[PDB]
Design an enzyme around this catalytic site. Structure first.
Site, short mmCIF file in Angstrom:
data_model
loop_
_atom_site.label_atom_id
_atom_site.label_comp_id
_atom_site.label_asym_id
_atom_site.label_seq_id
_atom_site.Cartn_x
_atom_site.Cartn_y
_atom_site.Cartn_z
N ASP A 75 -75.70 81.00 -33.89
CA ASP A 75 -75.17 79.73 -33.41
C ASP A 75 -73.97 79.24 -34.20
O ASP A 75 -73.02 78.70 -33.62
CB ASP A 75 -76.26 78.66 -33.42
CG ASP A 75 -77.42 79.01 -32.51
OD1 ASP A 75 -77.19 79.15 -31.29
OD2 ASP A 75 -78.56 79.13 -33.00
N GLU A 134 -72.12 79.10 -30.78
CA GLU A 134 -72.74 78.66 -29.54
C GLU A 134 -71.76 77.81 -28.72
O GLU A 134 -70.84 77.19 -29.25
CB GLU A 134 -74.02 77.86 -29.83
CG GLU A 134 -74.93 77.59 -28.63
CD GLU A 134 -75.45 78.85 -27.94
OE1 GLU A 134 -74.64 79.68 -27.47
OE2 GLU A 134 -76.68 79.02 -27.88
N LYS A 138 -88.62 83.93 -34.66
CA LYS A 138 -87.19 84.18 -34.81
C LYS A 138 -86.88 85.17 -35.94
O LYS A 138 -85.84 85.83 -35.90
CB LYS A 138 -86.44 82.87 -35.06
CG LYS A 138 -85.87 82.20 -33.82
CD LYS A 138 -84.64 82.94 -33.32
CE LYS A 138 -84.25 82.52 -31.91
NZ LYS A 138 -84.72 81.15 -31.58
MN LIG Z 1 -80.24 79.00 -31.60
MN LIG Z 2 -77.13 80.38 -29.61
#
Ligand SMILES: [Mn+2]
Ligand SMILES: [Mn+2]
Ligand SMILES: C[C@H](C[C@@H](C[C@H](C[C@@H](C[C@@H](CCN1CCCC1=O)N1CCCC1=O)N1CCCC1=O)N1CCCC1=O)N1CCCC1=O)N1CCCC1=O
Ligand SMILES: CC(C)(NC(=O)OCc1ccccc1)c1nc(=O)c(O)c(C(=O)NCCn2ccc3c(N)ncnc32)[nH]1
Length: 178
Positions: free
Chosen positions: A91, A63, A117
């Site tokens: 991430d 990320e 998720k």
């Molecule tokens: Mn995330």
């Molecule tokens: Mn992300």
């Protein structure tokens, strides 16, 4: 907008600039999409606190990079380690555990977001770690990766951001907009 000024007085300037580039990369404007602006900054800070826990070279931060560069590292991690290429950009990558991590910050119930998720990834091997704005957390296999003290810091910061939004009357719009 009032949210815009709060996010600028709340998160550090580089977190703000990094969010803006992430917004502008998808056409969103932080000056009208101000609730999505506070969310991207909060998600960005959690990922950087998360990588701050553990060993020095433990996490590769996915990320905060640009999409092509972020994939460039993911393809690099895969061919290096043999781990399967995920369908969506995660991430972090855990060099200690050899797995990608997806960080999630929720304003509903932690059990609902992880459920939201989990069916999207279907990658199985990708670890999922979720935090809430109220202090709970939920991770795949009940493996929380980091020690309890590092996760306690993240929960503390989230509730502080939660309190400061409420003291300014922006928490209700933030919660009722996810
Ligand atoms: Mn995330
Ligand atoms: Mn992300
Ligand atoms: C490496 C560099 C930037 C890093 C961002 C990340 C955030 C770090 C900020 C530092 C300063 N600290 C530490 C004390 C407070 C503070 O403010 N922390 C950690 C705590 C919260 C926070 O904010 N780190 C970690 C290494 C140094 C650094 O800055 N990023 C951006 C995305 C990828 C990445 O690794 N990079 C890399 C290339 C582009 C760029 O800019
Ligand atoms: C909040 C959100 C988008 N759910 C999200 N939560 C996470 O926890 C996460 O990890 C990602 C992520 O990783 N990548 C997504 C990159 N992306 C895609 C569209 C988009 C946008 N419109 N604005 C800013 N970023 C965007 N995303």
């Amino acid at each position: 907008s009032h949210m815009e000024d709060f996010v600028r007085q709340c998160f550090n300037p580089m977190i703000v600039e990094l969010a803006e580039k992430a917004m502008k990369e998808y056409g969103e404007d932080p000056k009208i999409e101000t609730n999505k602006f506070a969310a991207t900054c909060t998600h960005l800070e959690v990922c950087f606190m998360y990588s701050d826990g553990g060993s020095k070279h433990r996490f590769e931060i996915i990320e905060g990079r640009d999409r092509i560069m972020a994939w460039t590292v993911v393809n690099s991690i895969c061919n290096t380690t043999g781990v399967e290429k995920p369908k969506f950009l995660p991430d972090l990558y855990d060099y200690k555990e050899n797995r990608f991590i997806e960080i999630g910050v929720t304003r509903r119930e932690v059990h609902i977001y992880y459920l939201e998720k989990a069916n999207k990834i279907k990658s199985e091997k990708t670890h999922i770690h979720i935090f809430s704005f109220t202090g709970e957390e939920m991770a795949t296999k009940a493996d929380y990766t980091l020690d309890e003290e590092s996760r306690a810091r993240i929960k503390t910061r989230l509730f502080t951001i939660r309190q400061e939004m409420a003291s300014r009357s922006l928490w209700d719009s933030f919660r009722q907009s996810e």
